[PDB]
Design a protein around this nucleic acid. Structure first.
Ligand SMILES: [Mg+2]
Ligand SMILES: [Mg+2]
Ligand SMILES: [Mg+2]
Ligand SMILES: [Mg+2]
Ligand SMILES: [Mg+2]
Ligand SMILES: [Mg+2]
Ligand SMILES: [Mg+2]
Ligand SMILES: [Mg+2]
Ligand SMILES: [Mg+2]
Ligand SMILES: [Mg+2]
Ligand SMILES: [Mg+2]
Ligand SMILES: [Mg+2]
Ligand SMILES: [Mg+2]
Ligand SMILES: [Mg+2]
Ligand SMILES: [Mg+2]
Ligand SMILES: [Mg+2]
Ligand SMILES: [Mg+2]
Ligand SMILES: [Mg+2]
Ligand SMILES: [Mg+2]
Ligand SMILES: [Mg+2]
Ligand SMILES: [Mg+2]
Ligand SMILES: [Mg+2]
Ligand SMILES: [Mg+2]
Ligand SMILES: [Mg+2]
Ligand SMILES: [Mg+2]
Ligand SMILES: [Mg+2]
Ligand SMILES: [Mg+2]
Ligand SMILES: [Mg+2]
Ligand SMILES: [Mg+2]
Ligand SMILES: [Mg+2]
Ligand SMILES: [Mg+2]
Ligand SMILES: [Mg+2]
Ligand SMILES: [Mg+2]
Ligand SMILES: [Mg+2]
Ligand SMILES: [Mg+2]
Ligand SMILES: [Mg+2]
Ligand SMILES: [Mg+2]
Ligand SMILES: [Mg+2]
Ligand SMILES: [Mg+2]
Ligand SMILES: [Mg+2]
Ligand SMILES: [Mg+2]
Ligand SMILES: [Mg+2]
Ligand SMILES: [Mg+2]
Ligand SMILES: [Mg+2]
Ligand SMILES: [Mg+2]
Ligand SMILES: [Mg+2]
Ligand SMILES: [Mg+2]
Ligand SMILES: [Mg+2]
Ligand SMILES: [Mg+2]
Ligand SMILES: [Mg+2]
Ligand SMILES: [Mg+2]
Ligand SMILES: [Mg+2]
Ligand SMILES: [Mg+2]
Ligand SMILES: [Mg+2]
Ligand SMILES: [Mg+2]
Ligand SMILES: [Mg+2]
Ligand SMILES: [Mg+2]
Ligand SMILES: [Mg+2]
Ligand SMILES: [Mg+2]
Ligand SMILES: [Mg+2]
Ligand SMILES: [Mg+2]
Ligand SMILES: [Mg+2]
Ligand SMILES: [Mg+2]
Ligand SMILES: [Mg+2]
Ligand SMILES: [Mg+2]
Ligand SMILES: [Mg+2]
Ligand SMILES: [Mg+2]
Ligand SMILES: [Mg+2]
Ligand SMILES: [Mg+2]
Ligand SMILES: [Mg+2]
Ligand SMILES: [Mg+2]
Ligand SMILES: [Mg+2]
Ligand SMILES: [Mg+2]
Ligand SMILES: [Mg+2]
Ligand SMILES: [Mg+2]
Ligand SMILES: [Mg+2]
Ligand SMILES: [Mg+2]
Ligand SMILES: [Mg+2]
Ligand SMILES: [Mg+2]
Ligand SMILES: [Mg+2]
Ligand SMILES: [Mg+2]
Ligand SMILES: [Mg+2]
Ligand SMILES: [Mg+2]
Ligand SMILES: [Mg+2]
Ligand SMILES: [Mg+2]
Ligand SMILES: [Mg+2]
Ligand SMILES: [Mg+2]
Ligand SMILES: [Mg+2]
Ligand SMILES: [Mg+2]
Ligand SMILES: [Mg+2]
Ligand SMILES: [Mg+2]
Ligand SMILES: [Mg+2]
Ligand SMILES: [Mg+2]
Ligand SMILES: [Mg+2]
Ligand SMILES: [Mg+2]
Ligand SMILES: [Mg+2]
Ligand SMILES: [Mg+2]
Ligand SMILES: [Mg+2]
Ligand SMILES: [Mg+2]
Ligand SMILES: [Mg+2]
Ligand SMILES: [Mg+2]
Ligand SMILES: [Mg+2]
Ligand SMILES: [Mg+2]
Ligand SMILES: [Mg+2]
Ligand SMILES: [Mg+2]
Ligand SMILES: [Mg+2]
Ligand SMILES: [Mg+2]
Ligand SMILES: [Mg+2]
Ligand SMILES: [Mg+2]
Ligand SMILES: [Mg+2]
Ligand SMILES: [Mg+2]
Ligand SMILES: [Mg+2]
Ligand SMILES: [Mg+2]
Ligand SMILES: [Mg+2]
Ligand SMILES: [Mg+2]
Ligand SMILES: [Mg+2]
Ligand SMILES: [Mg+2]
Ligand SMILES: [Mg+2]
Ligand SMILES: [Mg+2]
Ligand SMILES: [Mg+2]
Ligand SMILES: [Mg+2]
Ligand SMILES: [Mg+2]
Ligand SMILES: [Mg+2]
Ligand SMILES: [Mg+2]
Ligand SMILES: [Mg+2]
Ligand SMILES: [Mg+2]
Ligand SMILES: [Mg+2]
Ligand SMILES: [Mg+2]
Ligand SMILES: [Mg+2]
Ligand SMILES: [Mg+2]
Ligand SMILES: [Mg+2]
Ligand SMILES: [Mg+2]
Ligand SMILES: [Mg+2]
Ligand SMILES: [Mg+2]
Ligand SMILES: [Mg+2]
Ligand SMILES: [Mg+2]
Ligand SMILES: [Mg+2]
Ligand SMILES: [Mg+2]
Ligand SMILES: [Mg+2]
Ligand SMILES: [Mg+2]
Ligand SMILES: [Mg+2]
Ligand SMILES: [Mg+2]
Ligand SMILES: [Mg+2]
Ligand SMILES: [Mg+2]
Ligand SMILES: [Mg+2]
Ligand SMILES: [Mg+2]
Ligand SMILES: [Mg+2]
Ligand SMILES: [Mg+2]
Ligand SMILES: [Mg+2]
Ligand SMILES: [Mg+2]
Ligand SMILES: [Mg+2]
Ligand SMILES: [Mg+2]
Ligand SMILES: [Mg+2]
Ligand SMILES: [Mg+2]
Ligand SMILES: [Mg+2]
Ligand SMILES: [Mg+2]
Ligand SMILES: [Mg+2]
Ligand SMILES: [Mg+2]
Ligand SMILES: [Mg+2]
Ligand SMILES: [Mg+2]
Ligand SMILES: [Mg+2]
Ligand SMILES: [Mg+2]
Ligand SMILES: [Mg+2]
Ligand SMILES: [Mg+2]
Ligand SMILES: [Mg+2]
Ligand SMILES: [Mg+2]
Ligand SMILES: [Mg+2]
Ligand SMILES: [Mg+2]
Ligand SMILES: [Mg+2]
Ligand SMILES: [Mg+2]
Ligand SMILES: [Mg+2]
Ligand SMILES: [Mg+2]
Ligand SMILES: [Mg+2]
Ligand SMILES: [Mg+2]
Ligand SMILES: [Mg+2]
Ligand SMILES: [Mg+2]
Ligand SMILES: [Mg+2]
Ligand SMILES: [Mg+2]
Ligand SMILES: [Mg+2]
Ligand SMILES: [Mg+2]
Ligand SMILES: [Mg+2]
Ligand SMILES: [Mg+2]
Ligand SMILES: [Mg+2]
Ligand SMILES: [Mg+2]
Ligand SMILES: [Mg+2]
Ligand SMILES: [Mg+2]
Ligand SMILES: [Mg+2]
Ligand SMILES: [Mg+2]
Ligand SMILES: [Mg+2]
Ligand SMILES: [Mg+2]
Ligand SMILES: [Mg+2]
Ligand SMILES: [Mg+2]
Ligand SMILES: [Mg+2]
Ligand SMILES: [Mg+2]
Ligand SMILES: [Mg+2]
Ligand SMILES: [Mg+2]
Ligand SMILES: [Mg+2]
Ligand SMILES: [Mg+2]
Ligand SMILES: [Mg+2]
Ligand SMILES: [Mg+2]
Ligand SMILES: [Mg+2]
Ligand SMILES: [Mg+2]
Ligand SMILES: [Mg+2]
Ligand SMILES: [Mg+2]
Ligand SMILES: [Mg+2]
Ligand SMILES: [Mg+2]
Ligand SMILES: [Mg+2]
Ligand SMILES: [Mg+2]
Ligand SMILES: [Mg+2]
Ligand SMILES: [Mg+2]
Ligand SMILES: [Mg+2]
Ligand SMILES: [Mg+2]
Ligand SMILES: [Mg+2]
Ligand SMILES: [Mg+2]
Ligand SMILES: [Mg+2]
Ligand SMILES: [Mg+2]
Ligand SMILES: [Mg+2]
Ligand SMILES: [Mg+2]
Ligand SMILES: [Mg+2]
Ligand SMILES: [Mg+2]
Ligand SMILES: [Mg+2]
Ligand SMILES: [Mg+2]
Ligand SMILES: [Mg+2]
Ligand SMILES: [Mg+2]
Ligand SMILES: [Mg+2]
Ligand SMILES: [Mg+2]
Ligand SMILES: [Mg+2]
Ligand SMILES: [Mg+2]
Ligand SMILES: [Mg+2]
Ligand SMILES: [Mg+2]
Ligand SMILES: [Mg+2]
Ligand SMILES: [Mg+2]
Ligand SMILES: [Mg+2]
Ligand SMILES: [Mg+2]
Ligand SMILES: [Mg+2]
Ligand SMILES: [Mg+2]
Ligand SMILES: [Mg+2]
Ligand SMILES: [Mg+2]
Ligand SMILES: [Mg+2]
Ligand SMILES: [Mg+2]
Ligand SMILES: [Mg+2]
Ligand SMILES: [Mg+2]
Ligand SMILES: [Mg+2]
Ligand SMILES: [Mg+2]
Ligand SMILES: [Mg+2]
Ligand SMILES: [Mg+2]
Ligand SMILES: [Mg+2]
Ligand SMILES: [Mg+2]
Ligand SMILES: [Mg+2]
Ligand SMILES: [Mg+2]
Ligand SMILES: [Mg+2]
Ligand SMILES: [Mg+2]
Ligand SMILES: [Mg+2]
Lengths: 49, 272
RNA sequence: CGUGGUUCGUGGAGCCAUGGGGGAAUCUGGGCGGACCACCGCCUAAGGCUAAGUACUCCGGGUGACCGAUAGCGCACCAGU
RNA sequence: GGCGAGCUAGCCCUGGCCAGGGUGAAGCUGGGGUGAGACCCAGUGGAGGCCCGAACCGGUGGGGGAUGCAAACCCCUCGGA
RNA sequence: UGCGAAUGCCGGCAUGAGUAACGAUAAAGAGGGUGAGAAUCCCUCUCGCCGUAAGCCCAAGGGUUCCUACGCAAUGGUCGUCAGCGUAGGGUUAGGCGGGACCUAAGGUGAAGCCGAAAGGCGUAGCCGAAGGGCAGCCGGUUAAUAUUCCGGCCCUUCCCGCAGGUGCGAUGGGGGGACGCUCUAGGCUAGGGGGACCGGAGCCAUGGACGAGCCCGGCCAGAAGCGCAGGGUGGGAGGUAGGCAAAUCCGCCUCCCAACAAGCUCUGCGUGGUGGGGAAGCCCGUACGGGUGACAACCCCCCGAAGCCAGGGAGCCAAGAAAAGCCUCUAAGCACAACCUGCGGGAACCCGUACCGCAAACCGACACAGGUGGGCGGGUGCAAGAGCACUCAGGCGCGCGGGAGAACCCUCGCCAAGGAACUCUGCAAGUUGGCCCCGUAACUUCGGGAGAAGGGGUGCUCCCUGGGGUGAUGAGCCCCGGGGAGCCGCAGUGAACAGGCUCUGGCGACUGUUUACCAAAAACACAGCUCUCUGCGAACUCGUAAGAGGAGGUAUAGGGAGCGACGCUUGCCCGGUGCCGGAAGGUCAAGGGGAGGGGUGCAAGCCCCGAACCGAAGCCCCGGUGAACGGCGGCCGUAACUAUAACGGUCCUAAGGUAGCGAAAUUCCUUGUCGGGUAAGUUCCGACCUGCACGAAAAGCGUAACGACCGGAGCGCUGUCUCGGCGAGGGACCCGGUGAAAUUGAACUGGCCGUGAAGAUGCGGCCUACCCGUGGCAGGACGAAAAGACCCCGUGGAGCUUUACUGC
RNA sequence: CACCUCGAUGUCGGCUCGUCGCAUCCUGGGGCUGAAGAAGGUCCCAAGGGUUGGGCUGUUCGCCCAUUAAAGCGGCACGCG
RNA sequence: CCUACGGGCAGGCGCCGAGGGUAGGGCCCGUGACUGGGGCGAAGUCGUAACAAGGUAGCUGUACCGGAAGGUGCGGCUGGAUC
RNA sequence: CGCGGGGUGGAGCAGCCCGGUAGCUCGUCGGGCUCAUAACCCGAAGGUCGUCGGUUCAAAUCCGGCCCCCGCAACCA
RNA sequence: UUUAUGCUCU
């Protein structure tokens, strides 16, 4: 039956994308946190062309 | 009149439709003077602020002329009477001698092909607009301005009208469709005649879907809710109100008056 | 008048601060010494700057009656993987 | 304090989809009818939260499954269409 | 700093156990090949399954999975020599396909501007934003793997420059256009398909017959201009002009005058078209596939025919159906040896994607998971039609453990003597019925319905006669609807498959519809419709600190709240309490005003405190009104010439004491009330009565045709439900080979009885019984497993909800 | 009453399958009778076997229909999920 | 089978057919818990509606209401007494 | 046998708190008006306060037991 | 402006 994950490359960037993260002060801290932790990826990796 | 149906389905048995014989070569509307695209939206910026709306037929907005002093003296011919989905009244497309076209809310009687005009001049017959002060006391009128130069606001609903009752200063005394006696400034434009399509009040939607077409989603009773939701929610097998009948937000809804007390407007009113 | 700060929770409640109303004076002027008054004293509000002594440890170093791979940092190992 | 409507609910914009058969509303035309009408009869017509029924949307009853094929499934049956 | 327990933590290894299982019952068999090894890889043949798919093409998503060589440790539920797996190499080619150097939509963002402690929230234009608008490529060939991308053929777009011709050119600005619904639809086409005695073609004559107008195979695709057929769009002049935020010669408006029609002018679709290209069966090779020939292949007539094209086609209808650019026209600044337009010529034309999977072993579900996933194509025959059903083309598959055996038991199926609901809470389940044509069809009814009511008859094949329609000719052929007559065969003719069991009578709900994703689909919600109430418009109301926004670009025939709930007949009395509404008086009432009068301190001027009368809002009090506002609508006693019963009376209380209509009911406790009906028998069912524990009128009352996967009662039909079982099939269970889990587990050398024990003993006492160990089975016990009881209580534990609890906002 | 069980001892009825007790429902054997016979009453012995099919209700139970030699009462965690 | 055989008879099939069966309608009669009124019946209960102006003139069609006769509204009739 | 309210002339009600005296309507009886009855008018009679005990100087009254009446409750199970 | 009523057969 229809599960929760329904991948959509635009949805993903539009939602957790880097630019989305930078618009909101709350998001900028996510990046602040993630960077401070040493995360290799500050943002969900996405593709398409 | 009003159209009826033989009961070849239930609902079709009680269903009743408007009579469209009064409607002159409508179908395609007048792309110029209207329409504009109409932003159909049921909530404000974000959230629902009027319950139970949405869906229903797409609509083009006919941008109608609610201020006629705009073209004083310039007469015009009534070209057609049209269907307007954005109001209960019908609209009348009129061609000005100017070559300018505008829609008006079609008054009762207003025949296709007759002349119309607005101004302090202006014969006191149907379709003509005049500053209130120049209208013979006792005549019925529609599409009145509430303050001069601010556009018509009163008596625009199908079948509605207002009567000029007397004069008092720079103000005249109207009896509004509500029955309220109000003073309006004499400079305010009105237009002689009642609105028309007065059979409007007598149609019967007939079915749930018919309400869906008009953009009205189902309305649910507080009685059917839970206490979380409404003053009337909860119980355990039906229930009287168990308190003064209230709205979802707590205020009483049977009698409790709501007009703001100390309101400048108060000084110009006198009825129900 | 309404509040905050002070140990002061309206208390005899001053002092410093100030959202609202009213609203001065320039040394014989003004503030304070815990309601108020007198006396005796202290200090000069409504402009501004000012090193050092102080706080911390991403970083480098030196030490340990500190751990010794289930410990010690989550990671002694290409782990914020 | 942030993260979530890529599940689900509602709404907004733009598209798409609904085999085949049945019933035969109004209106129209003609005829009868009358002072003129209402109206009646044919034919035409093709209305409907109309009927039967696939796709599609469902989830009624029963059986099976119960460390399952499956953290909601399978079969038969059934609702809308 | 010492561990045995914390359903402790981390790890390792055990038990169950060679046990369950190995993931759809579409299905397999043999020969040959490879190889250390083969049921599992390759090839051949036979068999089976999909075929509105289980075939093919797009979009998502995935991201090397693609092709090839060399490999089998692991991954593969077995095995693998194979693989979507390991190593390596290769593979994705565009001015025309998609997206971008185009347009705008919701929404997002946001110069101006507005608001907010900060963060930030709004917001006009503008900008961003697409599966919408716009825009130029069709047919073949080719690679192991890409192709509208490379190649071949034919055909187009834009940009730059240049000639020639032409014109007032010129825009982000004005105008036109783009430009739009749902249902039903016309004519003409196309895709697609069937047939052909005609055209082309390797071959074939079996097994009794056939050398035949035999069988088998194929009989097209693309194509500029021109042309032809069908169709879309469109009036042409002139005068006036004050409107289209400047200006227009354009558009709009008024008046004349000509066309009335596609006539013309255009733009599409289809046909034809120079030319180009494809081109079966079969046979021969070689696979791991494809290649040769068939060929110099043929390449044509008839018929059916779209939901697709001509397309902005037409008609009807109410719910009244995007935008912007491209484009055309108008003019403005400007410039007019510019510029723009037409034609020809030369040149210029960028970035991204392109492999492969894609109803699935490559996407979403931890899995090679019986689930989920949007658009297009989806052939033939038959069955009334159809995408339905059966069988089948192309194409694709037999589902990644097998071999046997023929027990119980389970699942999924088939049949059954006599009976026929006797089963059971219930006909649950299963049966019956079942498509089409015809005959026929009741109560009631809102006149539509109820109706597929009910109940019946027909249904195949053959020969003969025969009526209409389409296309062609007014014909033949090919299709398409039939009508009549005589016969034939079986148990049976919708011979297989897909196809309602029916009736009677209650309750609830009017109806279609909606809901507890995953135990409830309902008498619950919603619903048209009735009433009350608020709202005069910067409306009420809602969201927000605000700005702002929804309401609504609406205006009382409108909008908000509330209850009721189609429709029919109706909806009674009480305003004392609560709420709401009205009330310019009066009572009380806060800050404030006012200060009679008192006080502290000073030598004093004074400074500083209290403080009475009085004047001070809303609110409450008070006076009224109000029921489709919250709500409420009695008790005792007596009484008629048989008895009974009480129309009648007395008295006490109330704000008023329940009207109509209903009533042992979705309500009735006593209760299976009493009576009547149904049955041989009826706690239920139907009809009554009324003693209504405890109906009653918009939390509506009483009815109502139609409707319902709702709940109740009855009958007919028919049955494995049952008397009462039996036999049979297949998938499991069982045996053999391969792979191999799970909860659970203090340790065990783990028997019965009668006692005893913390009151239910394998473990204590007494007696009894009992050689050691398994396998298939049943479920009585191990107070069996599972979940630190959901009930209950306890905790000065928590949370949701309520109110005339308290206190606040 | 509150003794084992609340880190769980699943609760009525039906079905299935029983087994045991005897305070015996029938059948066998008896004594007494207000036992003529036949048929009963009442008590004693006796547990071997038997102890029907339906209507109603979830029912146990009970009422009822038709029968019968009889339509027995109990226990077994109100035996047995 | 008999023939006087292009024959008849027996025998076979077919139509219709008494009726039987199944299914659904129509009319009529009897009967039914209970229920509606009606008639009648020497001396029951409650009132007073009508006849005299009936002590509210009466009657009337309709509508609402009430233990009962009745009352009231609207309109109508005189078949109303009284100066 | 839980809680609450009751029991008073013939009927229905007061009086019970707080002590000391029993009141209202109806009915009953006598007399009147009337031809007569009712209505109406004038008079009068009638209760030991459910019951036994207790308290006080005194009990319908305050207290206790018993017998009846009405109302409410009987829930998780 | 207070009244209503009069058993059965002759
Ligand atoms: Mg779905
Ligand atoms: Mg997940
Ligand atoms: Mg996307
Ligand atoms: Mg989305
Ligand atoms: Mg890195
Ligand atoms: Mg917004
Ligand atoms: Mg937002
Ligand atoms: Mg209306
Ligand atoms: Mg509602
Ligand atoms: Mg609810
Ligand atoms: Mg909520
Ligand atoms: Mg609430
Ligand atoms: Mg409530
Ligand atoms: Mg209730
Ligand atoms: Mg202060
Ligand atoms: Mg403080
Ligand atoms: Mg304090
Ligand atoms: Mg203190
Ligand atoms: Mg202080
Ligand atoms: Mg001081
Ligand atoms: Mg201060
Ligand atoms: Mg201040
Ligand atoms: Mg000084
Ligand atoms: Mg000081
Ligand atoms: Mg001091
Ligand atoms: Mg002070
Ligand atoms: Mg100092
Ligand atoms: Mg300073
Ligand atoms: Mg400093
Ligand atoms: Mg350091
Ligand atoms: Mg060391
Ligand atoms: Mg280690
Ligand atoms: Mg470590
Ligand atoms: Mg070590
Ligand atoms: Mg560190
Ligand atoms: Mg670690
Ligand atoms: Mg590392
Ligand atoms: Mg928050
Ligand atoms: Mg969503
Ligand atoms: Mg489709
Ligand atoms: Mg006609
Ligand atoms: Mg005629
Ligand atoms: Mg037709
Ligand atoms: Mg017709
Ligand atoms: Mg339908
Ligand atoms: Mg239906
Ligand atoms: Mg259907
Ligand atoms: Mg189901
Ligand atoms: Mg369900
Ligand atoms: Mg079910
Ligand atoms: Mg099930
Ligand atoms: Mg099971
Ligand atoms: Mg220990
Ligand atoms: Mg341990
Ligand atoms: Mg085992
Ligand atoms: Mg086994
Ligand atoms: Mg097995
Ligand atoms: Mg299998
Ligand atoms: Mg071999
Ligand atoms: Mg070899
Ligand atoms: Mg094989
Ligand atoms: Mg082999
Ligand atoms: Mg296999
Ligand atoms: Mg992709
Ligand atoms: Mg790889
Ligand atoms: Mg491969
Ligand atoms: Mg391997
Ligand atoms: Mg291997
Ligand atoms: Mg393996
Ligand atoms: Mg596997
Ligand atoms: Mg090998
Ligand atoms: Mg590989
Ligand atoms: Mg190209
Ligand atoms: Mg493509
Ligand atoms: Mg492009
Ligand atoms: Mg460029
Ligand atoms: Mg844009
Ligand atoms: Mg913003
Ligand atoms: Mg901002
Ligand atoms: Mg762009
Ligand atoms: Mg696009
Ligand atoms: Mg497009
Ligand atoms: Mg393109
Ligand atoms: Mg082309
Ligand atoms: Mg390929
Ligand atoms: Mg190609
Ligand atoms: Mg090419
Ligand atoms: Mg231009
Ligand atoms: Mg269009
Ligand atoms: Mg057509
Ligand atoms: Mg073709
Ligand atoms: Mg030939
Ligand atoms: Mg032969
Ligand atoms: Mg030949
Ligand atoms: Mg052929
Ligand atoms: Mg052919
Ligand atoms: Mg073709
Ligand atoms: Mg061609
Ligand atoms: Mg013209
Ligand atoms: Mg001109
Ligand atoms: Mg202009
Ligand atoms: Mg062409
Ligand atoms: Mg052409
Ligand atoms: Mg050729
Ligand atoms: Mg070939
Ligand atoms: Mg269609
Ligand atoms: Mg079209
Ligand atoms: Mg059209
Ligand atoms: Mg633009
Ligand atoms: Mg020009
Ligand atoms: Mg110039
Ligand atoms: Mg060129
Ligand atoms: Mg080129
Ligand atoms: Mg490609
Ligand atoms: Mg695959
Ligand atoms: Mg593919
Ligand atoms: Mg699928
Ligand atoms: Mg698909
Ligand atoms: Mg595939
Ligand atoms: Mg598999
Ligand atoms: Mg799958
Ligand atoms: Mg998967
Ligand atoms: Mg499903
Ligand atoms: Mg699908
Ligand atoms: Mg087919
Ligand atoms: Mg066919
Ligand atoms: Mg056939
Ligand atoms: Mg068919
Ligand atoms: Mg198709
Ligand atoms: Mg199929
Ligand atoms: Mg095949
Ligand atoms: Mg398998
Ligand atoms: Mg057989
Ligand atoms: Mg049988
Ligand atoms: Mg039989
Ligand atoms: Mg039968
Ligand atoms: Mg039974
Ligand atoms: Mg039964
Ligand atoms: Mg049931
Ligand atoms: Mg039943
Ligand atoms: Mg069934
Ligand atoms: Mg018929
Ligand atoms: Mg019916
Ligand atoms: Mg009918
Ligand atoms: Mg039938
Ligand atoms: Mg039939
Ligand atoms: Mg038949
Ligand atoms: Mg046959
Ligand atoms: Mg013909
Ligand atoms: Mg044709
Ligand atoms: Mg023909
Ligand atoms: Mg069949
Ligand atoms: Mg069938
Ligand atoms: Mg059927
Ligand atoms: Mg319903
Ligand atoms: Mg109803
Ligand atoms: Mg439904
Ligand atoms: Mg649902
Ligand atoms: Mg559910
Ligand atoms: Mg749930
Ligand atoms: Mg269920
Ligand atoms: Mg349902
Ligand atoms: Mg908001
Ligand atoms: Mg607010
Ligand atoms: Mg505002
Ligand atoms: Mg607004
Ligand atoms: Mg608006
Ligand atoms: Mg309701
Ligand atoms: Mg009353
Ligand atoms: Mg009241
Ligand atoms: Mg009142
Ligand atoms: Mg009140
Ligand atoms: Mg008030
Ligand atoms: Mg006052
Ligand atoms: Mg004061
Ligand atoms: Mg003062
Ligand atoms: Mg003094
Ligand atoms: Mg006041
Ligand atoms: Mg008053
Ligand atoms: Mg009422
Ligand atoms: Mg009350
Ligand atoms: Mg009474
Ligand atoms: Mg009585
Ligand atoms: Mg009596
Ligand atoms: Mg009153
Ligand atoms: Mg009642
Ligand atoms: Mg009443
Ligand atoms: Mg009964
Ligand atoms: Mg009740
Ligand atoms: Mg009977
Ligand atoms: Mg009976
Ligand atoms: Mg029941
Ligand atoms: Mg009944
Ligand atoms: Mg009720
Ligand atoms: Mg009510
Ligand atoms: Mg109702
Ligand atoms: Mg009812
Ligand atoms: Mg249902
Ligand atoms: Mg059976
Ligand atoms: Mg078998
Ligand atoms: Mg094995
Ligand atoms: Mg004992
Ligand atoms: Mg024991
Ligand atoms: Mg021992
Ligand atoms: Mg011992
Ligand atoms: Mg022992
Ligand atoms: Mg011993
Ligand atoms: Mg053993
Ligand atoms: Mg065993
Ligand atoms: Mg066991
Ligand atoms: Mg078992
Ligand atoms: Mg516990
Ligand atoms: Mg507690
Ligand atoms: Mg607590
Ligand atoms: Mg205990
Ligand atoms: Mg104890
Ligand atoms: Mg335990
Ligand atoms: Mg357990
Ligand atoms: Mg005895
Ligand atoms: Mg015996
Ligand atoms: Mg004897
Ligand atoms: Mg004995
Ligand atoms: Mg039953
Ligand atoms: Mg019973
Ligand atoms: Mg029995
Ligand atoms: Mg017991
Ligand atoms: Mg038990
Ligand atoms: Mg169980
Ligand atoms: Mg049981
Ligand atoms: Mg016959
Ligand atoms: Mg007959
Ligand atoms: Mg009959
Ligand atoms: Mg009778
Ligand atoms: Mg008497
Ligand atoms: Mg009598
Ligand atoms: Mg009288
Ligand atoms: Mg009278
Ligand atoms: Mg009278
Ligand atoms: Mg009279
Ligand atoms: Mg009465
Ligand atoms: Mg009258
Ligand atoms: Mg009393
Ligand atoms: Mg008494
Ligand atoms: Mg008292
Ligand atoms: Mg008296
Ligand atoms: Mg007397
Ligand atoms: Mg006593
Ligand atoms: Mg005493
Ligand atoms: Mg409770
Ligand atoms: Mg009397
Ligand atoms: Mg008399
Ligand atoms: Mg009498
Ligand atoms: Mg007599």
């Amino acid at each position: 039956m229809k599960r929760t994950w329904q991948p959509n490359r635009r949805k993903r960037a539009k939602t957790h994308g880097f630019r989305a993260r930078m618009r909101t002060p709350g998001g900028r801290k996510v990046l602040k946190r993630r960077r401070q932790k040493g995360r290799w990826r500050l943002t969900p990796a996405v593709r398409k062309r | 009149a009003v159209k009826k149906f033989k009961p070849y389905t239930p609902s079709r048995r009680f269903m009743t439709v408007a009579d469209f014989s009064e409607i002159t070569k409508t179908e395609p509307e007048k792309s110029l003077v209207k329409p504009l695209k109409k932003t159909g939206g049921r909530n404000n910026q974000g959230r629902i602020t009027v319950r139970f709306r949405g869906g229903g037929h797409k609509r083009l907005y006919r941008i109608i002329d609610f201020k006629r002093w705009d073209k004083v003296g310039i007469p015009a011919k009534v070209a057609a009477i049209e269907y307007d989905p954005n109001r209960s009244a019908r609209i009348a497309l009129l061609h000005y001698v100017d070559g300018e076209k505008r829609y008006i809310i079609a008054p009762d009687g207003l025949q296709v092909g007759q002349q119309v005009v607005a101004g302090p001049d202006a014969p006191i017959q149907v379709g003509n607009a005049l500053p209130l002060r120049f209208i013979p006391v006792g005549t019925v009128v529609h599409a009145v301005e509430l303050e001069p130069k601010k556009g018509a606001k009163l008596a625009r609903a199908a079948g509605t009208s207002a009567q000029i009752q007397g004069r008092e200063g720079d103000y005249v005394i109207l009896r509004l469709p509500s029955g309220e006696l109000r003073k309006v400034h004499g400079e305010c434009y009105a237009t002689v005649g009642a609105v028309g399509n007065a059979d409007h009040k007598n149609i019967v939607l007939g079915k749930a879907g018919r309400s869906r077409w008009l953009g009205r989603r189902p309305h649910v009773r507080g009685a059917a809710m839970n206490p979380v939701d409404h003053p009337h929610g909860g119980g355990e097998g039906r229930a009287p109100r168990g308190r003064p009948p209230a709205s979802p937000w707590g205020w009483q809804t049977k009698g409790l008056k709501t007009r703001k007390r100390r309101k400048p407007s108060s000084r110009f009113i006198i009825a129900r």
